[PDB]
Each structure stands twice: as structure tokens, then as C-alpha cells.
Design a protein around this ligand. Sequence first.
Ligand code: ZGA
Length: 284
Amino acid sequence: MTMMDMNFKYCHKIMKKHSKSFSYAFDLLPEDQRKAVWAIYAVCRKIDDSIDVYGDIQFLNQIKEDIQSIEKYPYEYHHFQSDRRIMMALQHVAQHKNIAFQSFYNLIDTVYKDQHFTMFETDAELFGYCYGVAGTVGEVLTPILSDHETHQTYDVARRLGESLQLINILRDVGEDFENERIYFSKQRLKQYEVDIAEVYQNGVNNHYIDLWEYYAAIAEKDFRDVMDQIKVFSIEAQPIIELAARIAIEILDEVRQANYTLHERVFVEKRKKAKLFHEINSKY
Ligand SMILES: C=C(CC[C@]12O[C@H](C(=O)O)[C@@](O)(C(=O)O)[C@](C(=O)O)(O1)[C@H](OC(=O)/C=C/[C@@H](C)C[C@@H](C)CC)[C@H]2O)[C@@H](OC(C)=O)[C@H](C)Cc1ccccc1
């Protein structure tokens, strides 16, 4: 192992321990792309953690400054302030791919702002947040998942990330509620007559199913459009991106099968993921 190998292996360790769902898919990719994805995943997880868990603006400030050092001087040796091994790997990636640094900065700002979770007033603000935490990630991942760095490729990758964020929301509403988080907008909860705490206590009702399915329909339409444009991605990523769309839809059906429960985390079995992947890439 070279030292750089050890940096990527560390990034992999972070992905493998925490990623119950992304990890299976992304490790189906070829080696250079897989490694780049590990470094991006590790950096984004550290960003998300810094606030949610380790509890400091300064660690987040350190991450931003490290990324800024890489952008300004991609070939200089930096004494990274945040996590050395992760930043060395990201710098290696940036020497080989066009990283959309402003997307990292948008992500960091969104994570900062989320510190004080004010509920979203409008779907526009919810979707603005889906962009900030996940559209941005799709943007970062674009030059890794594709050889085309056109408007269309970034737009598809952004939409894929934001829709994945919406699936995540739809799966985790109970868990999120326990953590003092509601992502459905106040405008939409008000329209559908849903109080999450009330539902958490008294079971799923029809007003809630309707609200949930309103947002699920948005997610499903967005995935169909991503699938329509699968070919903007590289030939090796296409099957993996298709699996992601598919698992996303499978999660929506599991929630539905579990009658929209707020009291367990539905998940797609690893064996079933393999079944879905097999089905998919026989077409390739
Ligand atoms: C913090 C983040 C993780 C949030 C997350 O936390 C969970 C948890 O902490 O428990 C998680 O660990 C888990 O559920 O196990 C999970 C995971 O599986 O990874 O990770 C969850 O994912 C899913 O639920 C996936 C559902 C399927 C539909 C997946 C399809 C697409 C099959 C391919 C997700 O909520 C993100 O960063 C920010 C800024 O949000 C990434 C790091 C961003 C990134 C993503 C990919 C590449 C590079 C960067």
C-alpha cells in the first residue's frame, strides 16, 4: 500500500460502516470511480456529522477551509485542519476530475443553516433544502459518474440527488420526528390537515397517507425523468444509477406495505437488492 491507498482505504472504512444502502451500489462501480465516490462520501458525511453529532461550527469551518485550500492550490502540500486522510484523498480526486467546489460550499451553508431547524414554510424551501444537501452532492459526483460535463448531465445528477433526498424523507418521518425534525412543509401539512406528533401518537390516518403520497408522487415522476435520461451517465455507471432509482421505488413500496408506519425503519434486504440488480443489468 502506498500512503494514498491508505487514505482511500480509510475513506472506504467510513462508507462501509455507516452506509447501509449507498455502499452496495457504489462498490459495484469500477475501481477509479469507486475510490473517488468513497472520498466524496467520506467528506460529505463528515460535513453532515460535524453539526449533527460532533457539535462544532469550527470543525465545519475547518472542512470548508481545507476544501478551499484544495481549490486554490490543487498541487501544493496542505496541513489539513479537518480530517487529513479524507482531504488528501479528495485533493487526489480534484487533481484528476473537475470538482464543482461551489457545490461543496452550498452543501456546507445548508448544513450550517440546518443547525437551527426551522420547519419549512413552503415546498419551495423544502426543495431548496433538498438541493442544498443532496442536489449539490449529485453535482459533485457528476464528473465521476459521467464523461460529459454538459448542462444536461449536471441537471440529471442534481435531480437524482434531490429525489433520493425526498425518498429518504419519506422513509424516515417517524425517526426524524423523534429527533425533533419534520421535513414536510407547514403549507402542505396545513392543507392536508396533518399533525405529525398527533400521527406519531395515534397511528397513520387518511389525511396522512394522502400527504405522504402527494410527496411520493413527486419523487416517482422525478425518477422516471432521470431514467428517461440515463444515457448522460458513463456506461459503467448507468446500471448502478438505474439500481438506485429502482431501490428508491422499492423503499416507497415497503413503506406502503408497512402501512406508512412511523415506528420502524423499512429497508430493502441486501439479497433483494442483488435480485433487482440482476434483473437490471441483463439489459446491458
Ligand atoms: C450524510 C449523508 C449520508 C446520509 C445517509 O445516512 C444514513 C444513516 O446515517 O444511517 C445512511 O448511512 C443509511 O441509511 O445507512 C445512508 C446511506 O445508506 O449511505 O447515508 C442513507 O442513504 C440512503 O438511505 C440510501 C437509500 C437508497 C435509495 C440508496 C440508493 C440510491 C442505492 C444506490 C442516508 O440517509 C450524505 O451526505 C449529506 C450531506 O447528506 C451522503 C454522505 C452523500 C453522498 C452519497 C453518495 C455518494 C457520495 C456522497
